[PDB]
RNA sequence: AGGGCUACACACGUGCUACAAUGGCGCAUACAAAGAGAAGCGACCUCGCGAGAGCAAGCGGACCUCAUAAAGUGCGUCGUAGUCCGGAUUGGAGUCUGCAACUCGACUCCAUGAAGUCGGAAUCGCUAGUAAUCGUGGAUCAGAAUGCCACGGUGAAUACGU
RNA sequence: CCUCCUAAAGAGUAACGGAGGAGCACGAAGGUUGGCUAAUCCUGGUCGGACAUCAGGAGGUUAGUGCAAUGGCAUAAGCCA
């Protein structure tokens, strides 16, 4: 909870004058990042969606949930069941733990990264944004992994809008780009 | 050892070894090793780790895989999305060099389409 | 490309291009001296580079000047 | 004046260079012939990583310059890998020629590092200093040779027979 | 043999009338207990594009139902164990 008490101080607070809120219950908590990485493929492998499985089950302290289908009219192919995800949300401790470990570490562990962006978010007031590739960060070893990665991840928070949605994030260490 | 990037350049001598790197060459390892304080003959491989730890901090100095070919391709982009004969060779996949199209450019262009 | 040290162009169109820099921009340029450098007096300018049956538009853009005006008029036309 | 003869899905002839260890690369080092040259060949020295530049002697030639032969040989390395093989491609930046290097010049530095592991049917040259291989010079020409013409180094195999 | 209309708001009704299906399938696709709920669109997300997986919002039985059609189904018969 090393980041979620910064909240409470830092936070909170600063928003409570910024967007001048009037009750502590109000100011836009951090509600769990979410992590899914639609691996699909699998009919060529299948192997490699157990492998993007692990591989999650690496960057996060929990249990990847593989996904399936569910239209099955899917021209890729699909049919109704058939593996081809594992979104694995964030809980808790862990969540903040996690939005510790990237912002910090994955973030920083970059490519080319010069900037985040400042439009990921929603209408509500949510952000998420592709790595693009998995950093190898903290994961089941470096050098030994398989082709590449990549993910999606999303943050999620009571914010009633997408401004509001700023202000978190922008309080913690969120990198963005400006 | 990653070094720049990935690449374990392993089991061979310093120079060649080194040049496995994406962005140096030939002239650049037989370089960067002196200057960085390293022989040639010497296997990266059983090199001592400190040894290593400099080569490193000296090749950060040289453009490499990462931003190399970033910004080798941005330069391509420049002179194509500007109207030049360059640019003009690109998107058609011919000789910007100026070569002969008539006959040989199966290497600049395809193979067969007969 | 190299030449040395030396931007080279033709009297023709410095003549031209230099009255025009300071009489603001106008009407295109007639010129073939397209084996000419481009310079950052010409940016934004109107250039009509005859390429062989007739002028062609052109734009001195930045990126657009360490360039010869002939390699911005295709001179053979293919398909 | 500028462009075109350097166009391109393509096909054919002649070649150059590779596929490597009878080799690549590093270092040291031995032997040659034949030529060219006062809008020329241009040393030595200095600067530049280098192409080259500055200054500037000599030679109109068995006197001077182009000009440092390459193989080879000694040591060392690589240990057979698409590789320290092979270099196309392209990018960035330059040198020189010439009014003038876009189309279309030759070369240099760094980077990049494709095809290619000896090539089907078919087909070519060569009987000895020949073939094979290695370098060298000249004509043309301001400046664009793997072409042409010429030079020497090393140096085979095979011919029953028609 | 089953379904709808013909069929005049009970049942039932004819034509060489207008339209479709059956001759099976399941040891679970049966039983019960416990839990779940869609289609579709918008927006924002690595490779993810018309159309996979993910996040929200709108939406509300327009989904689903082993196979026709009608009636039915959220206390779900629909879905998972
Ligand atoms: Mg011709
Ligand atoms: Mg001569
Ligand atoms: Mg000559
Ligand atoms: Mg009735
Ligand atoms: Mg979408």
């Not at chain 2, 002239?27 to 022989?39: E, F, V």
């Amino acid at each position: 909870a090393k980041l979620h008490d910064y909240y409470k101080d830092e936070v909170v607070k600063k928003l409570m004058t910024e967007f001048n809120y009037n009750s502590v219950m109000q100011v836009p908590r951090v509600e769990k990042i979410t992590l899914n990485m639609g691996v699909g493929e699998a009919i060529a492998d299948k192997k490699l969606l157990d492998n993007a499985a692990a591989d999650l089950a690496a960057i996060s302290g929990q249990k990847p949930l593989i996904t399936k289908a569910r239209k099955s009219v899917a021209g890729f192919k699909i049919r109704q069941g058939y593996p081809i995800g594992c979104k694995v949300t964030l809980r808790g401790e862990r969540m903040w733990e996690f939005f510790e470990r990237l912002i910090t570490i994955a973030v920083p562990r970059i490519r080319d990264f010069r900037g985040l962006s400042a439009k990921s978010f929603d209408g509500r007031g949510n952000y998420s944004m592709g790595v693009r590739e998995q950093i190898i960060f903290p994961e089941i070893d470096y050098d030994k992994v398989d082709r590449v990665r990549g993910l999606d991840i999303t943050i999620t928070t009571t914010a009633k809008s997408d401004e509001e949605g700023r202000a978190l994030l922008a309080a913690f260490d969120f990198p963005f780009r400006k | 050892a990653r070094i720049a990037g990935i690449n374990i350049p392993d089991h061979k001598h310093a120079v060649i070894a080194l040049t496995s790197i994406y962005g140096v060459g030939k002239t650049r390892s037989k370089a960067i090793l002196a200057a960085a304080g390293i022989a040639e003959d010497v296997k990266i491989s059983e090199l001592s780790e400190g040894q290593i730890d400099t080569l490193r901090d000296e090749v950060a100095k040289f453009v490499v895989e990462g931003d190399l070919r970033r910004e080798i391709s941005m330069s391509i982009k420049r002179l194509m999305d500007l109207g030049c004969y360059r640019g003009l060779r690109h998107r058609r996949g011919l000789p910007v060099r100026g070569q002969r199209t008539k006959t040989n450019a199966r290497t600049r262009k395809g193979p067969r389409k007969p | 490309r190299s030449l040395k040290k030396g931007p080279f162009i033709d009297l023709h169109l410095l003549k031209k291009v230099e009255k025009a820099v300071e009489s603001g921009d106008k009407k295109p340029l007639r010129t073939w001296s397209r084996r000419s450098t481009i310079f950052p007096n010409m940016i934004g300018l109107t250039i009509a580079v005859h390429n062989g049956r007739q002028h062609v538009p052109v734009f001195v853009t930045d990126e657009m000047v360490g360039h010869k005006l002939g390699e911005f008029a295709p001179t053979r036309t293919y398909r």
